[PDB]
Every structure is written in C-alpha cells, then in structure tokens.
Design a protein around this ligand. Structure first.
Ligand SMILES: [Mg+2]
Lengths: 548, 48
C-alpha cells in the first residue's frame, strides 16, 4: 500500500565459482529513475530534412534526412556494459577468464512515486511539489518483440553507469519509411545534383502503437512490476585475442644458419636460394618460395572498401567493416579496419563535473591482429618478372579513375570462402551487450555493435509513460490543448543479468597482458575533490590465444 | 540413357502409373517483404 516499500535496492556483483572452473557471474543493478510527462499525449510522424547541409556538394556524407514516428513513451534500455559492471568487476572478468556466456536476464520496477508540481505558491513566488497518491505510472513490456528494436546503446542513451546517481529513460522512437535520392558530387561540380525526398512507399508503411500491441500495467505507489526470468541462447564471447596473420601460420622455414652472438642485427639466415627451396605455393609460375609466397591454409581477415558509401531507397550509408587491428607499431587505418568510435556524455563515462555540451570520445582499437594495412597491399602481373616494372604492378600509390587520392584498395574486397574472422570484442563500458538478429532469410555472420546476438528471440523492450493526469477542464471534442496537471514520477529499477564464464589457464612460460593501475591511469577510478567522476574505455581480449 | 538407368513401365489403355508420395523438407518461404535499409535500423536520433 502507500507507506510500504515494494522492493529492494541491489547493485551487487556476485561471482560464484563452481567445479571445473565454471563461474556464475550474477550482476545485479539498481537505479533511481526520473520521468516527466510527455510533451504531448500524441503519436507524430516527423520528417527530418537537411538540404541546408547536403546541397553543399561534396557534403553527401552529411546527410541526416529521415522520417520518424514520435511516441509519448520512454524506453528503459539497460543494454550496455556500464550498467552491470564497475571497472573492478570488469578487471576480474577480463584478466582471469577465457570466455563468457550470456545466461539470463530479469528486471522489475518498484517503489513508485508520482508527484504533481503545480506550482505558484507564493511571492518570489516559488514552486511546490505534492504527492499524487492516486496517480498511476504506465508500464508496458513488449515480450513478444512486437515492436521495432531500438537499442539505446548506439546513441549513448541507456541508463546511468553510476549506482548512486539517479537517471532517466529516453523518449522512445522509431524509423518510419521514406523514399530518398541523393546523387554524389564534389566541390568543383556545378549545377545542382539531384537531392530530393520523394515521400512514402505505401507498401512499406508500419505505424506502431504501444497501446494496441502490448498490455499496459498501471502502477500506483504501492504496486510493483516484475518481468519473468528470460533465458538466452547464443554463442560464447571469447576474452582472448588472436595475434597471427597469414605470415605466421604453420611451420617456419628451417634456418641453416643460426646467429652466434647476441644483439640487434645478429640475424639468422634461411640459407637456401629462394628458387631452390622446398615447399608449396599457389603461384604456378615461379619456383620462388618466400614467406609472402608460401601457401597458408586459409586467409585471416579480409579487405574492404573504405570509405565506401552505398545507397538504396532511403539514401546513402557507410559500408561497415569487420576486422581490426591491422597496423603494426602505433599506425592503423582506423577506417580500413572499421575501428569504432564512441561518443558519450557524463551519464555514461565523461567527467560529471565537465561543463559544456561537447561529448567525450574514443576509438576502440582491438587487440586481435586480424585487420589490414592497405598501404602495404599490391598486385603484380601474372608474369611475375621481378624486380617488377611499373607497368606490371598496381600500387596503392597509383591513382584510379584519374583521382589523386584514390587507389585500388579503396574499392578492394578480398572476402571469400577462405576468409577467417573473429567476432567483435566487447567495448567496456559503452558497448552494447546483446542485439536482436535480423529477420532476413539469410543472416550476418556477426554484428559490429554487440558480441551476443539472439537468433532465438531477444528480451522485450520496457516502456514507461506517466498517466494522463487531467484537470477538470477537459473537452476532447475541442482542438485546443490538452490541459493536464503537471505530473512526473520517480521509480526504482532493478535488474539481474547472469553470465556463465570459464577460467583461463597459463600455457606459456611468459606472463601476459592484463589490466591494472599504474601511476598513470590511477585517477580515472576514483572521484574528485567535488563529486567526481569518470569511467574510462578499457579493452577486453587481453590474453593471447592461438590461431593455428 | 533412360534405358540403362531407370525402370521403364509399359502402359496400355487399361494401365496406370502412380508415384509414391514424396515428402519435402526445406526452410519456409516467407510471404512478407522487408523495407528497412541500413538507413533505417534501430533508434532514430532524438529531435529537439
Ligand atoms: Mg597486436
């Protein structure tokens, strides 16, 4: 009832160790949540159109043009690592365990409070807040995944990463169909390249409402709402990186000449003429057998177009890349490897004391050496007459289609039935955790935003909304504004995400990469003179594996 | 040659030839189209 709590705060992370090194990580999470009434109690179809920026020519990539259905609902998304682990937890996981399964997920809403502002009372004149005991908070759980999946992790719009700091949902909203053409161009191009928004393909219209699709629960102060326990089924995500590229697969060539003093240029030598060597290559012509020529069982990684943009009905979009890392010592083609870049604000990692609207950012460079360094690519002529003539080789230097800044690698693609890959490593703390699978008849071998993908069915989305708190003035037949009592709600959210992981083991003489602090580093894990605080980007697949 | 590979039945007026019932198993073919391209996947950006 009124003065009786309906739940328990728990942001505790339990590690229950079992036999044969299986661990049972139960991450509990709780937050205090704030939510105001909708700007209007209506659904809206809104179109965004920036000809302002696209008409510029050479500015195609700055397209934002789209259509959208505005909901009076807010979305409680907790799909991001920061909601479930602090750095310490993350340290433990990443340093000691070899893989990670996603087991179960449950959540509840409790200790609901609804208060009305209203208002004016009196002289300066000040504001005053009262409890509306009889008021209701609307909660709806889409357990059928009836409605479009809109993971908030892409927009850094999940719940807060701090337990002792309150948080908010985000106004929910989803994509509505629109036709759209935009032809590319450059600064030099004159005339106006066609740049139009055609409208809406009626065959593709889907207008969704919570009200017609999901049962809605009314919660008063004394009520509570809990979902069941959802059980996952997905592959494991591994917490080790692989380091071998093709150049280190299999048996290294026998050295007939070993060095006889230590030092920095005391190399060893194969000691056989490159054309009198034994072994296997896929070059029918030469008898040359070199490390760049010798057969390898397959191909680690693949080359992709960059910055490639492709277009269909609704406009242009970047072509996504799987692999990475590809560069050697501190130099990687952060576009060729499609290395991701995360932008976020205070609630999700940036220093909470920082003023100004400019977000904090970082670019995740994986540890797994499976990407490409397109500067180092090339193509020789069939004849392999070498040292190779300029006419018989195509370099990443030689311009294509008469453009100075373009070479073949920009349109190159060596994906194929010998391509080998790893899945994306988890990005702590801003990374998504799980993602729904596409409802296409054929599916992607992975996703780039999350390591766990539900081909099963994913947990349903949770939607909240403050109940219409009407005044005595109400005429629905009238076009005039809905006059509503200004109302808002505070509620507590508790979630439990259960993982099952497996402990790693030492197989080498040498020790390995692991997190720690560090006389550097040390100050990102504590608050400040004021109320702190900061959460920092921090890798995941620290320990080496073994491809072959 | 048909002849060396398949049993051949000779049918006169009063004869008939019937096959068994063959049972398939393949994945389902869907009678719905998908409309979303990359430009429409997930959470649209918040409008201020
Ligand atoms: Mg490396």
């Amino acid at each position: 009832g009124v003065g009786i709590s309906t739940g328990t705060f728990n942001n505790q992370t339990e590690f229950k160790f079992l036999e044969n090194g299986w661990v049972y990580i139960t991450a509990n999470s709780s937050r205090l949540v704030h939510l105001n009434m909708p700007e209007s109690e209506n659904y809206r179809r809104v179109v965004v159109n920036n000809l302002d920026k696209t008409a510029v020519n050479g500015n195609m990539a700055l397209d934002d043009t789209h259509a959208e259905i505005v909901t009076p609902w807010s979305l409680v998304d907790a799909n991001a690592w920061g909601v479930w682990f602090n750095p310490g937890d993350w340290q433990l996981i990443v340093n000691t365990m070899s893989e990670l399964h996603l087991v179960s997920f449950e959540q509840e809403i409790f200790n609901v409070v609804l208060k009305t502002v209203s208002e004016s009372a009196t002289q300066p004149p000040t504001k005053v807040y009262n409890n509306d005991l009889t008021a209701s908070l609307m909660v709806a759980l889409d357990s059928n995944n009836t409605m479009p999946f809109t993971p908030a992790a892409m927009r850094s719009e999940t719940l807060g990463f701090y337990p002792w700091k309150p948080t908010i949902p985000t106004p929910w909203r989803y994509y509505f169909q629109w036709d759209r053409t935009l032809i590319p161009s450059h600064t030099g191009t004159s005339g106006t390249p066609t740049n139009i928004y055609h409208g809406t393909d009626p065959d593709d219209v889907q207008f969704y409402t919570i009200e017609n699709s999901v049962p809605v629960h009314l919660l008063r102060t004394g009520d509570e709402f809990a979902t069941g326990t959802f059980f996952f089924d997905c592959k494991p995500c591994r917490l080790t990186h692989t380091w071998q590229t093709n150049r280190a697969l299999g048996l290294p060539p026998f050295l007939n000449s070993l060095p006889q003093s230590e030092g920095g240029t005391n190399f060893g030598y194969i000691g056989v003429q490159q054309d009198k060597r034994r072994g296997v290559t896929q070059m029918g012509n030469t008898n040359y057998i070199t490390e760049a020529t010798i057969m390898r069982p397959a191909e680690v990684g693949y080359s992709a177009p960059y910055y490639s943009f492709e277009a269909s009905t609704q406009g242009p979009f970047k072509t996504p890349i799987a692999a990475g890392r590809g560069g050697a010592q501190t130099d990687e083609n952060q576009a060729a490897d499609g290395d991701p870049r995360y932008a976020f604000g205070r609630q999700h990692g940036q220093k909470t004391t920082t003023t100004g609207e400019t977000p904090e950012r970082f670019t995740y460079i994986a540890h797994q050496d499976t990407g490409r360094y397109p500067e180092g690519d090339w193509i020789q002529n069939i004849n392999f007459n070498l040292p190779v003539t300029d006419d018989n080789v195509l370099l990443p230097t030689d311009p294509i289609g008469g453009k100075t800044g373009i070479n073949y690698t920009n349109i190159f693609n060596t994906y194929g039935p010998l391509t080998a890959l790893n899945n994306v490593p988890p990005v702590y703390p801003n990374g998504q955790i799980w993602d729904k699978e596409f409802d296409t008849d054929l599916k992607p071998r992975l996703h780039v935003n999350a390591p766990f993908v539900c081909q099963n069915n994913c947990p349903g989305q949770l939607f909240v909304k403050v109940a219409p708190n009407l005044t005595n003035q109400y005429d629905p037949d009238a076009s005039a504004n809905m006059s509503r009592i200004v109302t808002y709600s505070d509620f507590w959210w508790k979630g439990k995400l259960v993982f099952k992981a497996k402990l790693r083991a030492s197989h080498t003489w040498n020790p390995i990469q692991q997190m720690s602090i560090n006389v550097d580093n040390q100050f990102n894990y504590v608050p400040s003179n004021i109320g702190g605080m900061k959460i920092v980007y921090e890798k995941s697949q620290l320990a080496p594996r073994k491809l072959y």
